[PDB]
RNA sequence: AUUUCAAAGAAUCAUUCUUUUUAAAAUCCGAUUUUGUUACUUUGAGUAAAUUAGAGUGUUCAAAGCAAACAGUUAAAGCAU
């Protein structure tokens, strides 16, 4: 049943506690998740511990087709009920293929650009920021090589007072996808 | 303009050189090893001597040359029994 339907990986307690607050919010029938949370698929999920130690963040990948389709539709309002069963802070991306051109790889006649490593994490920096949208990207080149992204959000979602906390949230959240420094801000 | 960023360790003087690992496809016993072409570059292979650079070597020195050196008044010694 249930279990089956949502978890792609193999059965797991803190996945299918996801896959039950999606259940809960879909048995209820919340008012405005719209045509409800059932076509969600989760793929798997990691588990970060920030610095600052304000709450764990959960990790949440899944299938590329069920993401754009049905997730990013949707993605404001299902996020906040989600968040609001969780008891933990979560993010939704979807997984992408990655593979270098020289690997000479069955299926391809040249790698789409959708595949390119830099695309992908551009892609996913959006992904992971989803409910606020990005204003420009900055790359600071530190004296000793490190290489920091300083990223711009919105001034819509700058007026919330969990701001701070989600921008450390970002900026873990990408480190450990990919092992770049992030910085993130809000207008003046 | 454009397409795979990097990370951590070990060696070593705050420096430096190095190793490990981070998608995908094919293969071999869940682990193990392969993946455009050319220019460019690295090593190599094979490559007349004389000349040339250059080592060894006091032709009376040097130009040269390719020789020489050692000990023995004819034995010490080495090796054949």
């Not at 595949?115 to 990005?134: F, N």
Request: net charge positive.
């Amino acid at each position: 049943a249930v279990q089956k339907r949502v978890l792609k990986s193999n059965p797991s307690d803190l996945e299918k506690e996801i896959a039950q607050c999606l259940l809960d919010i879909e048995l209820s029938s919340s008012s405005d998740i719209k045509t409800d949370a059932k076509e969600i698929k989760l793929l798997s999920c990691d588990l970060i511990e920030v610095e600052k130690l304000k709450k764990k963040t959960i990790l949440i990948y899944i299938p590329y087709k069920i993401y754009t389709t049905y997730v990013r539709k949707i993605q404001r309002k299902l996020i906040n009920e989600l968040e609001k069963k969780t008891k933990k802070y979560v993010v939704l991306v979807a997984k992408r293929t990655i593979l270098k051109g020289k690997q000479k790889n069955k299926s391809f006649k040249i790698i789409p650009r959708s595949r390119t490593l830099t695309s992908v994490y551009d892609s996913i920096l959006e992904d992971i920021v989803s409910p606020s949208e990005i204003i420009g990207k900055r790359i600071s080149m530190k004296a000793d090589g490190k290489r920091v992204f300083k990223i711009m959000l919105d001034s819509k979602e700058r007026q919330r007072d969990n701001i701070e906390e989600k921008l450390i949230s970002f900026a873990a959240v990408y480190k450990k996808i990919t092992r770049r420094d992030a910085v993130f801000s809000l207008p003046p």
